[PDB]
Design a protein around this ligand. Structure first.
Ligand SMILES: Nc1ncnc2c1ncn2[C@@H]1O[C@H](COP(=O)(O)OP(=O)(O)O)[C@@H](O)[C@H]1OP(=O)(O)O
Ligand SMILES: Nc1ncnc2c1ncn2[C@@H]1O[C@H](COP(=O)(O)OP(=O)(O)O)[C@@H](O)[C@H]1OP(=O)(O)O
Lengths: 378, 378
């Protein structure tokens, strides 16, 4: 299918639209990153909420890696306030944290381990109706959590997923002023996450014309604008910001692929968006070598960028990575350590449900060989 | 903003998904075109509904030009059956008819003249909550009514509009088998409607990146595939079918423009999609002459099609019209008659609320001159 729950508000100054969006709600809770507080954006959001006649309470300074345990720490405060509207302001992790909070707040009867999943050998129960409106306000460009029905967080040190349309945000507000405060490396990494989301969404087994429309526009936009953006160009930051959400609309519908999976299993090495960028060329090469469908799809993307072939697309991504100063795997982690982890990462990758949507189903050995090839870095 | 209420089901054989979609509903009413009945598609839809355990009742053979009076004729039968789900199967007009039925069925207390509008001097009341689920199944490619919140119909011989998210369909099913039965001229005209919707949506004052993504994909698809489709190529018919809905998603959000308005005011001359095709080159020329914004936007579309300039885009559309055998205005209607109607059409165009979204606000005289220029046909 193709669907989109979230209503998207976008444009310069569009944070102020929060006043209109909270109309009819009296008690607004905002979870925000430390950076949203420091830059004064949290106080602006609070001001916009109070303009509309609501009371507001904010919890700022959330851990970068969300966890059930930390959410359980402030859940009592949330229940004491009793919001009828939730706002997430910050990166993907802040949105993920707020999505999980929504589940716990709206359905306190649920057992976490019964509704979340670790991998394809989990069997989660479906989440029931979750009534509290959720507004997502991304400050990075970006993970696309502001339109997805997915959240990732730890419990007991282990990484879990929750996926349901019940936590896809009702509203996303895309005000490019917020991502203009990303430091350069965050702009680079989150930008490359957009590119990899787009390219993977375009080549899954369940891509539609409708998801493709969004994936192709996101890819073109990042390709043209990300380097200017990383160096602080104000318009480029806006263009890439909207592109991040486009890629989110794409992968919400088309899912993601082997690159996202391998990147997540290698997260100990460094930032997702960066590891995605490093692995993508190798994933594209692998997929094209084993699937004429994938090769043809990569060539279609190449033609949208002004080239011809799958090979061109792989070379374009590699050169963009260099332009943006993305390191080789070798420069992030030493051979001994990598080789010691490669087996478990390849198995955990193989155990990821996303593999089913990749245009090729890889064997654990192939994935292991793939990790090793990316490490050798040629 | 950007939003999409409708969930889109698309693909070969996807009419059978109706069984899944009627789950939880016991009484399904289907409004269908004569052609849907004759080709056996109505009986298939009925079969799919009965599979799911529901009862079904169908009203087939709807007038091509919907009217309140004709809807009021079969409303008693509808109320007697008491559907909890409505299905529209056919062209844009069948979907429009079913949307209006939904209003009358769900909110029988409303006065038609108080909630519908004729032009910008109307002041309609907002439509309240309309609860009955609506599934739209287009057989042409197409008007985009399957994703819009709009309906057009006559009352007392006068053309009215109803626009509310309450009549945007809950679900659209896009099964390319249905539009493969369009005759060639209907495939041509509805196809050119897609192209004009896309180009207008791309150049309104409220276009966003998100609507653009859909508009650009629709434009490219029609340009590449419509001529093959009109001659009966099965894959081309599928590609253009999905493109029609993309253009609908675009104009749902970005609105339409001077071409749609002038075409509707000249409907006495012939089929909408065709009149749209004839007028577009002249509208694009006008808009580009008065707006550097429009000119630049037309050049962006040109570059997506493999060219450079606004002038290129105007020449591309003109040559596509010739390839498809679209006539000159002169060959549809004689000069005396045209000149006698030109004043009222230009005034009624000027009185259309859509004019506000066109990148240029034209004067009644300019619109009159524009109609005359298109008639001279150079
Ligand atoms: N607009 C912004 N200004 C400054 N720093 C920002 C920022 N957006 C994100 N960051 C930083 O960039 C990092 C990435 O945040 P994240 O982990 O949510 O990213 P992602 O969106 O990929 O999930 C964080 O360390 C964040 O700092 P805070 O936790 O203190 O907010
Ligand atoms: N799939 C199909 N097979 C045959 N004729 C079709 C068709 N789809 C549309 N048409 C015809 O094409 C014409 C256009 O229908 P319409 O007015 O709903 O078009 P639109 O979609 O532009 O609103 C109608 O005369 C219709 O014939 P019926 O009214 O008898 O159905």
């Amino acid at each position: 299918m193709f669907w989109l729950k979230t209503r998207i508000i976008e444009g310069e100054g569009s944070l102020s639209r929060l006043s209109r969006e909270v109309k009819g709600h009296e008690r607004v809770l905002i979870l925000a990153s430390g950076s949203m507080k420091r830059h004064g954006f949290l106080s602006e959001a609070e001001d916009y909420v109070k303009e509309a006649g609501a009371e507001v309470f904010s919890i700022a300074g959330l851990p970068a890696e969300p966890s059930v345990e930390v959410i359980e720490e402030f859940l009592p405060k949330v229940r004491e306030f009793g919001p009828d509207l939730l706002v997430a302001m910050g990166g993907g992790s802040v949105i993920d944290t707020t999505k999980a909070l929504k589940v716990f707040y709206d359905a306190p009867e649920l057992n976490f381990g019964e509704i979340a999943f670790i991998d394809r050998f989990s069997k989660p129960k479906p989440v029931p109706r979750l009534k509290t409106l959720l507004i997502a306000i991304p400050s990075t460009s970006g993970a696309g959590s502001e339109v997805s029905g997915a959240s990732v967080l730890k419990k007991g040190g282990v990484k879990y997923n929750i996926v349901t349309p019940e936590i896809a945000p009702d509203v996303a507000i895309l005000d490019p002023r917020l991502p203009r405060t990303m430091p350069p490396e965050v702009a680079r990494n989150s930008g490359l996450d957009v590119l990899v989301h787009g390219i993977e969404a375009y080549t899954t087994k369940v891509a539609s014309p409708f998801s493709d429309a969004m994936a192709i526009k996101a890819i073109k936009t990042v390709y043209r604008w990300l380097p200017l953006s990383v160096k602080g160009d104000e318009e480029a930051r806006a263009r890439v910001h909207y592109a991040a959400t486009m890629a989110g609309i794409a992968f919400l519908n088309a899912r993601l692929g082997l690159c996202h999976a391998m990147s997540h299993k290698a997260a100990w090495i460094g930032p997702h968006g960066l590891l995605n960028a490093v692995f993508l060329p190798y994933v594209m090469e692998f997929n094209a070598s084993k699937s004429d469908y994938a090769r043809r799809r990569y060539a279609e993307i190449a033609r949208e960028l002004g080239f011809q072939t799958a090979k061109d697309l792989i070379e374009v991504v590699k050169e963009l990575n260099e332009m943006l100063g993305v390191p080789k795997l070798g420069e992030l982690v030493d051979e001994e350590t990598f080789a010691s982890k490669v087996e478990e990462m390849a198995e955990k990758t193989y155990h990821d449900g996303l593999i089913a949507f990749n245009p090729v189903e890889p064997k654990p050995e192939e994935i292991k060989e793939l990790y090793l090839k990316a490490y050798r870095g040629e």
